[PDB]
């Protein structure tokens, strides 16, 4: 267990031979300094005897207490489950460390003395906001964009996978990444492929669900949110639809727009605090880029500004080829007629027409999709 970090060599080197034989020196010499213990003074077993001596100190009614302060000479004021706090002492099997104000501990039943500490079952909110597995396919699913893919790999993936290029340059990666354009252009769809690609811990939050009904619970949720973001390791925080905090007013929020404002002050801190931030990357997306505070859009808080245009028609046919890949396409259809149906169709429009056309095939129990399925499919999807 963390015995010797020299695992370099990577061939038949004698260093590897003599170093492993010198671990054989510390282990053969001192396995002959392991024999003599119970040979000279048995007197107990020490594998369970002293262990059951601790376990006979501590009683079976193990009350669970809570720390609020520490005085160093193994006594402190701890909180009971009732609320009536005591001034008990602290044992020697308490490994005086994992002790923070607010920590769950183990107390005596009789004199309530600090027996042990307790591992924390955390909070469900971390599992709620934490993405567990890879969502979907890779960047090859996207198609047609091919320019800002280098931008997102540039700001996010390449700093993670290659920590050499910035050091030979003497430079740091850009901090904030923002994504904006028309709706349905694949803004979240890119973050899907990012969540495929990365090995870092990934968090995702919608900008609508920031707002609350109580006072300050918003900014408190921000503070514990970036707490959770920092307390892991390398992490990626994704924010979707952050214009919605400024556009829609809801009557659940007791404070008006000058509570949303203070939430924006707390978040505005949490992007560029004086504190040591750490390895937390920020990726954001919206469609109303013009509405929110430019103080959050300044370089230093968001460095990279990425626009998504509408798909041009030669990229459209690629997206048709993507969403019509694994389907039994009857040769009746011509995709070029489907291209210029809408002059500004999104990538979601293509997939919607494809899926609804498959629904029209499954109404008639067929296996292939014909041309009239698309003819009435664009009427169903587009025109209403």
């Amino acid at each position: 267990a963390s015995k010797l970090p020299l695992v370099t060599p990577h061939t038949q080197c004698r260093l590897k031979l003599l170093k492993l034989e010198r671990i054989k020196d510390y282990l053969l010499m001192e396995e002959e300094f392991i024999r003599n213990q119970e040979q000279m003074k048995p007197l107990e077993e020490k594998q369970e005897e002293e262990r059951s001596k601790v376990d006979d100190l501590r009683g079976t009614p193990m009350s669970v207490g809570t720390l609020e302060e520490i005085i160093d000479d193994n006594h402190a004021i701890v909180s009971t489950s009732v609320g009536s706090e005591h001034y008990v002492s602290i044992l020697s099997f308490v490994d005086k460390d994992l002790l923070e104000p607010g920590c769950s501990v183990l107390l005596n039943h009789k004199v309530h003395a600090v027996i042990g500490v307790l591992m924390d079952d955390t909070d469900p909110l971390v599992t709620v906001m934490k993405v567990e597995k890879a969502p979907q396919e890779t960047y090859a699913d996207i198609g047609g964009l091919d320019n800002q893919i280098q931008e997102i790999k540039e700001s996010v993936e390449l700093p993670l996978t290659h920590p050499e290029y910035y050091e030979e340059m003497g430079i740091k990666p850009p901090k904030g990444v923002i994504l904006y354009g028309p709706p349905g252009t694949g803004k979240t769809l890119l973050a899907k492929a990012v969540a495929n690609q990365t090995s870092a811990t990934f968090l995702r939050v919608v900008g609508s669900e920031l707002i609350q009904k109580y006072l300050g619970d918003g900014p408190k949720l921000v503070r514990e949110l970036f707490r959770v973001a920092e307390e892991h390791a390398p992490s990626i925080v994704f924010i979707d639809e952050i214009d919605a905090i400024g556009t829609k007013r809801y009557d659940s929020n007791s404070g008006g727009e000058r509570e949303i404002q203070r939430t924006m002050l707390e978040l505005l801190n949490q992007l560029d605090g004086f504190d040591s931030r750490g390895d937390v990357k920020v990726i954001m997306a919206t469609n109303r880029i013009e509405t929110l505070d430019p103080a959050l859009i300044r370089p230093g808080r968001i460095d990279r500004k990425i626009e998504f245009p509408l798909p041009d028609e030669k990229t459209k046919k690629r997206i048709f080829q993507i969403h019509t890949s694994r389907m039994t396409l009857a040769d009746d259809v011509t995709l070029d007629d489907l291209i210029m149906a809408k002059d500004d169709l999104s990538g979601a429009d293509i997939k919607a027409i494809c899926t609804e056309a498959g629904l029209m095939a499954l109404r008639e129990r067929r296996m292939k999709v014909t041309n009239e399925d698309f003819k009435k499919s664009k009427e169903n999807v587009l025109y209403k």
């Binding site: 469900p124 909110l125 709620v128 906001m129 609350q212 619970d217």
Partner: protein, 47 residues
């Protein structure tokens, strides 16, 4: 849901429902704990 045997769970945004979802439930997403525990389920919503 009655015929395909799913958990018909409507949400209404009340506060007596709240105590079985969580203590504060700062999101709505904490319902998904019970939802993936009754994995063939259907969520229903009013106007």
């Amino acid at each position: 849901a009655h015929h395909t045997d799913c958990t018909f769970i409507r949400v209404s945004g009340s506060e007596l429902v709240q105590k079985f979802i969580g203590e504060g439930a700062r999101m709505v997403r904490e319902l998904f704990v019970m939802a993936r525990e009754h994995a063939p389920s259907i969520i229903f919503m009013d106007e």
